[PDB]
Design a protein around this ligand. Structure first.
Ligand SMILES: Cn1cc(-c2ccc3cc(C(=O)Nc4ccccc4N)ccc3n2)c2cc[nH]c2c1=O
Length: 125
């Protein structure tokens, strides 16, 4: 297929461990972004076939989306909050490097990123 396998979302041999920051990332950050009116293009991996983006996975080396992040948080896949923050950053970077500035998708990403950064400003210690 034009599309890669989706990113892994479970780690069967990793111990389960919560942190205050991981709780915040799921229950505050992800939840707020997931419900936002602009979330829909970011709730699942980019399907380059259906969206007619034949060069997407040539350009984007590290695919990322909020459906993957959500499942990773729910499955306790991340060892620490910084790994999760990096996935959010990667998802936004992918959007900004692939799509033309001023494309609707870019303005949506920017609105979501602004909300993300505001919540990250209040990340627990
Ligand atoms: C991250 N990302 C994501 C997308 C992405 C993903 C999911 C999409 C889904 C629809 C869709 O179902 N539209 C629809 C159909 C019927 C009724 C109402 C609506 N809104 C339309 C466009 C989509 N574009 C994208 C496209 C170019 N570049 C990117 C890009 O970088």
């Amino acid at each position: 297929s034009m599309n890669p396998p989706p990113p892994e979302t479970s780690n069967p041999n990793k111990p389960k461990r919560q942190t205050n920051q991981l709780q915040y990332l799921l229950r505050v950050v992800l939840k707020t972004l997931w419900k936002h009116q602009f979330a829909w293009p970011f709730q699942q991996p980019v399907d380059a076939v259906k969206l007619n983006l034949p060069d997407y996975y040539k350009i984007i080396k590290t695919p990322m989306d909020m459906g993957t992040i959500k499942k990773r948080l729910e499955n306790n896949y991340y060892w620490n909050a910084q790994e999760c923050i990096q996935d959010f950053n990667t998802m936004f970077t992918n959007c900004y490097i692939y799509n033309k500035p001023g494309d609707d998708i870019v303005l949506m990403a920017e609105a979501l990123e602004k909300l993300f950064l505001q919540k990250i400003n209040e990340l627990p210690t």
